[PDB]
Amino acid sequence: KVTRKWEKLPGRNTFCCDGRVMMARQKGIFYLTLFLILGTCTLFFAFECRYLAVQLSPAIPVFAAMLFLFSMATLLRTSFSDPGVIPRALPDEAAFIEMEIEATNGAVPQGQRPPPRIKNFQINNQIVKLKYCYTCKIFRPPRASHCSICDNCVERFDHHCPWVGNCVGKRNYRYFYLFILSLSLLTIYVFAFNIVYVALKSLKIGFLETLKETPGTVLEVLICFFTLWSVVGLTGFHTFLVALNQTTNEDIKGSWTGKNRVQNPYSHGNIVKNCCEVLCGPLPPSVLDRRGILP
Amino acid sequence: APVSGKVFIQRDYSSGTRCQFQTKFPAELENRIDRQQFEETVRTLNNLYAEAEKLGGQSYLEGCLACLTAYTIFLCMETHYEKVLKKVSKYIQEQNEKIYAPQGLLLTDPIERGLRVIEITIYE
Ligand SMILES: CCCCCCCCCCCC(=O)OC[C@H](COP(=O)([O-])O)OC(=O)CCCCCCCCCCC
Ligand SMILES: *C(=O)CCCCCCCCCCCCCCC
Ligand SMILES: *C(=O)CCCCCCCCCCCCCCC
Ligand SMILES: *C(=O)CCCCCCCCCCCCCCC
Ligand SMILES: [Zn+2]
Ligand SMILES: [Zn+2]
């Protein structure tokens, strides 16, 4: 048997379908999200699209299926994919880095913890300070951070969203944003058309008999109402962080949105170029090969 | 081959958050290889990685063409960044086998070290 590079790859991730996947360990809520989406869409496609196709235009279920396939493809690409994990430092390179660090630190006062290892760079006429990571034994590249759950430095870290079952970094943030947007669209769609179905069928049979026919309608109404009340606010929050070119991890810190309001050096001073660079720009491949062959 | 010491060409974030390597000349590399070919190699790698992360028309067109297929086309087609990392790897290995191995030095591909540094290994 061959020894792939994922069974030895440190961290708290899980690898299924032979290694071509990468998810967190606490993927409990991922199954719940999958079951909710699939169950609500199947209830729709089996109890309301049939009627709204026989007795209305036949484009309703086809467009709903297009939105649902888009949402499913983007959710699976957000969860399964590699969020841009940085490989840990090899022993010699880490030793060399720490040697430079101690040589530059000089004599430390006794009884006092040494000052935090901080490197300062000049990005776009701005002072940017990296921070040492005592686990990965590297200097966090700009915009990177450390997910305390997964325990691996994600590049352009955003947050560890469990509802998708995986971190959200650089390689899978466009897919996460598009999944959120398409799920908000699909929720508004299913909700509006379930209301249309109830109105159009109660005008013919009545309310009590319509309800006694299928309770799937009120089930979907409740599910879509709450899913909207959450996901719409979420997508409104993200459409303003994919435009100013910021990350949730930075907004939480209140760095650029606070007392200073100094320019974030990673931006472009626009909204169109920012949206294009974050959504439709080019992305690096997986920097840690998992299907690689170890000796 | 035995090792005598390792130097690393740290990344450069001066122009932006895009892959670009510093052009400083190492002190240990002195008397082992003339600075001209080293500067050239670093400049060629910089230009290649610039062609990788270059925004504009081609990148946005390819992005929209992929979004038109729910990002299911990346299961069969190799993206642009990989289509230039292949050239980067080929150029690095050919430049190594040409000029670096005779002097007793080794140039590694930055896609191994996580696109962070260049591990130049000095032999004796
Ligand atoms: C309602 C259902 C709609 C289905 C639409 C079809 C596509 C759905 C998503 C398929 C999975 C997918 O795209 O995952 C991509 C990532 C890539 O990971 P990495 O290579 O970027 O590290 O992970 C993988 O490469 C996944 C590997 C396993 C899946 C292989 C592709 C399966 C496609 C569908 C086959 C029926
Ligand atoms: C590895 O750990 C895999 C476990 C995580 C969930 C596995 C199932 C993913 C969803 C696949 C089914 C969606 C396709 C729907 C077909 C219409
Ligand atoms: C690890 O568990 C990898 C799982 C990948 C799951 C992909 C989901 C299957 C999609 C089916 C494609 C369409 C056929 C179904 C009827 C339209
Ligand atoms: C860059 O390559 C892509 C730019 C972002 C695309 C925005 C997508 C808007 C909503 C997508 C949902 C489409 C559902 C299909 C029916 C309307
Ligand atoms: Zn780390
Ligand atoms: Zn994590």
* Active-site annotation holds for A150: no
A240 and A191 in a common domain = yes
Q: Which amino acid is at A101?
A: I
User: Token match 């292949």: residue?
Assistant: B86
Distance, in Å, from the CA atom of A81 to the CA atom of B70, rounded to the nearest integer, reads 15
Whether B16 and A281 lie within 8 Å, measured CB to CB: no
A233 and A169 in a common domain = yes
Answer yes or no: is the C-beta of A181 below 6 A from any ligand 4 atom: yes
A106 and A73 in a common domain = no
Answer yes or no: is the C-beta of A41 below 6 A from any ligand 2 atom: no
A170 and A98 in a common domain = no
> Measuring CA to CA, which residue among B58, B118, B57, B51 is closest to residue B85?
B51
Assign 3-class secondary structure to chain A: CCCECCCCCCCCEECCHHHCCCEECCCHHHHHHHHHHHHHHHHHHHHCHHHHHHCCCCCHHHHHHHHHHHHHHHHHHHHHCCCCECCCCCHHHHHHHHHHHHHHHCCCCCCCCCCCCCCEEECCCCEEECCEECCCCEECCCCCEEECCCCEEECCCCECCCCCCCCECCCCCHHHHHHHHHHHHHHHHHHHHHHHHHHHHHCCCCHHHHHHHCCHHHHHHHHHHHHHHHHHHHHHHHCCCCCCCCCHHHHHHCCCCCCCCCCCCCCCCCCHHHHHHHHHCCCCCCCCCCCCECC
Dihedral angle over CA of A50, A51, A54, A57, nearest 10 = -100
Distance, in Å, from the CA atom of A293 to the CA atom of A72, rounded to the nearest integer, reads 31
Across the strands, what pairs with A152? A147
**Cα A171 to Cα A154, A157, A182, A219, distances in angstroms:** 10, 10, 19, 36
User: Token match 């179905």: residue?
Assistant: A197
A229 and A178 in a common domain = yes
**Domain extent at residue A113:** 91-140
Q: Which residues contact A130 (CB under 8 A, 6 or more apart)?
A: A118, A119, A120, A121, A139, A140, A141, A142
Resolution in A: 3.4
Across the strands, what pairs with A129? A120
Q: What's the number of domains chain A is made of?
A: 2
Q: What is the DSSP string of chain B?
A: --EEEEEE--B--SS-SS--B--PPPSTTTTTS-HHHHHHHHHHHHHHHHHHS--SSHHHHHHHHHHTTTT-GGGTS--HHHHHHHHHHHHHHHHIIIIIHHHTEE---TTTTTSS--EEEEE-
Domain ranges of chain B: 3-123
CA of B118 to the centre of ligand 2 (A): 39
Whether B70 and A69 lie within 8 Å, measured CB to CB: yes
Q: Alpha-carbon torsion A65, B76, A11, A253, what sign? A: negative
A255 and A126 in a common domain = no
Length of chain B in terms of residues written: 124
Burial of A170 by CB count in 10 Å (0-12 exposed, 13-18 middle, 19+ buried)?
buried
A162 and A69 in a common domain = yes
Across the strands, what pairs with A85? A154
Give first-to-last CA distance, chain A, whole Å. Answer: 12
A19 interface with B at CB cutoff 8 Å: no
What pairing do the DSSP bridges indicate for beta strands B105-106 and B119-123?
antiparallel
Distance, in Å, from the CA atom of B9 to the CA atom of A96, rounded to the nearest integer, reads 13
A257 and A175 in a common domain = yes
Q: Which residues contact B39 (CB under 8 A, 6 or more apart)?
A: B23, B25
A35 interface with B at CB cutoff 8 Å: no
A117 and A80 in a common domain = no
The pick from A181, A186, A231, A242 for probing ligand 4's pocket by mutation, whose C-beta has the most ligand atoms within 8 angstroms, reads A181
Length of chain A in terms of residues written: 295
> What approach was used to elucidate this structure?
cryo-EM
What ligand is nearest to the CA atom of residue A188? Answer: 4
Of the partner residues A70, A282, A287, the one whose CB lies closest to the CB of residue B59: A282
Distance, in Å, from the CA atom of A97 to the CA atom of B38, rounded to the nearest integer, reads 22
In this structure, is residue A126 part of a structural domain? yes
A103 and A81 in a common domain = no
Q: Which residues contact A176 (CB under 8 A, 6 or more apart)?
A: A74, A78, A158, A161, A164, A168
Answer yes or no: is the C-beta of A23 below 6 A from any ligand 2 atom: yes
What ligand is nearest to the CA atom of residue A75? Answer: 1
A112 and A60 in a common domain = no
**Cα A38 to Cα A161, A271, B82, distances in angstroms:** 19, 35, 34
B32 interface with A at CB cutoff 8 Å: no
A chain contacts of residue B15, beta-carbon cutoff 8 Å = 124
A112 and A232 in a common domain = no
In this structure, is residue A291 part of a structural domain? no
In this structure, is residue A248 part of a structural domain? yes
User: Token match 């993206």: residue?
Assistant: B79
In this structure, is residue A270 part of a structural domain? yes
